[PDB]
UniProtKB/Swiss-Prot annotation:
Name by which UniProt lists this protein: Nuclear receptor subfamily 1 group I member 2
Biological process according to GO: cell differentiation; cellular response to molecule of bacterial origin; intestinal epithelial structure maintenance; intracellular receptor signaling pathway; negative regulation of DNA-templated transcription; negative regulation of transcription by RNA polymerase II; positive regulation of DNA-templated transcription; positive regulation of gene expression
Location within or outside the cell: Nucleus
Domain NR LBD intervals: 5-266
Alphabetized UniProt keyword annotations: Activator, DNA-binding, Metal-binding, Nucleus, Receptor, Transcription, Transcription regulation, Zinc, Zinc-finger
Residues of the full protein shown: 142 to 434 of 434
Gene Ontology cellular component list: chromatin; intermediate filament cytoskeleton; nuclear body; nucleoplasm; nucleus; transcription regulator complex
């Protein structure tokens, strides 16, 4: 069984998640849409078509082009708007958690800058349909273009399929978010020991939750698999930060919030 402090910790994380995760994406609006050397390699990894289902029942569908000049950039303003919406939710999530509110403001900033991408991807995994290869974001859908084995070569995509296969509960997703947010080794963190102890507590709570609620042979080593996925997600984070910085170098597109989170100064 979980201790009372562990149950309290899960309840606080679950409360934060329900208050700040717009799972129907109902408040995502006014976003941009595509017009009616190494950077080229970066942009060709994630090929998705886009579908918008109107409230009236109409459907708009967008297929992207092939790498033939600037057409490589057509989906960037939209994805920047979606990422920014997601990041705002992640910041709200962190800010309503007491363990986070109690850290120095500078460490709050450093932890969010370290983890925003990772928590965004963890939330996106919960709307991933692995059978159809689509992220279902309310009236918006992102569908992977046509194989499956070739798609698992891209580390982000393999991440989403492998995490979805673990069939996690909401509670395990929110503890993954907590363990990623409270990483004591993000650059600029001052309360290294406080953050390390918090992270350890969240990981212990996760290990115990799995021990108490998941007896099936399929869930053996589940805790260790989850921690391996978090390590992989940190590596994916570093790689995509580099991709973003290269693209932004050649073709500015980051929103103000993305600039803040990725360290771009405006000069
Ligand atoms: C929502 C899904 C999971 C479908 C996506 N997720 C990213 C994604 C990938 C990497 C990073 C981010 N976030 S980020 O760094 O602020 C950013 C925003 C625009 S470039 C970088 C993402 F949202 C996508 C993306 C980004 C750019 N092009 C294309 N074709 N797909 S599709």
């Amino acid at each position: 069984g979980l201790t009372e402090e562990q149950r309290m910790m899960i309840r606080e994380l679950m409360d934060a998640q329900m208050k700040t995760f717009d799972t129907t994406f109902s408040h995502f609006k006014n976003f941009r849409l595509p017009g009616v050397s190494q950077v080229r390699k970066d942009l060709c990894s994630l090929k998705v078509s886009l579908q918008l289902r109107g409230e009236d029942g109409s459907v708009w569908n967008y297929k992207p082009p092939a790498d033939s000049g600037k057409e490589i950039f057509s989906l960037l303003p939209h994805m920047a708007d979606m990422s920014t919406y997601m990041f705002k939710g992640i910041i709200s999530f962190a800010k309503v958690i007491s363990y986070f509110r109690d850290l120095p403001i500078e460490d709050q900033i450093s932890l969010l800058k370290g983890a925003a991408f990772e928590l965004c991807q963890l939330r996106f995994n919960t709307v991933f349909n692995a059978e159809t290869g689509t992220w279902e974001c309310g009236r918006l859908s992102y569908c992977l273009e046509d194989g499956f084995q070739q798609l698992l070569l891209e580390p982000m995509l393999k991440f989403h399929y492998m995490l979805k296969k673990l069939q996690l509960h909401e509670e395990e997703y929110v503890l993954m978010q907590a363990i990623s947010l409270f990483s004591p080794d993000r650059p600029g963190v001052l309360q290294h020991r406080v953050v390390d102890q918090l992270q350890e507590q969240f990981a212990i709570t996760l290990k115990s939750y799995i021990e108490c609620n998941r007896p099936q042979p399929a869930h053996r080593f589940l805790f260790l698999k989850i921690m391996a996925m978090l390590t992989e997600l940190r590596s994916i984070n570093a790689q995509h930060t580099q991709r973003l910085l290269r693209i932004q170098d050649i073709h500015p597109f980051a929103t103000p919030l993305m600039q803040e989170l990725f360290g771009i100064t405006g000069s």
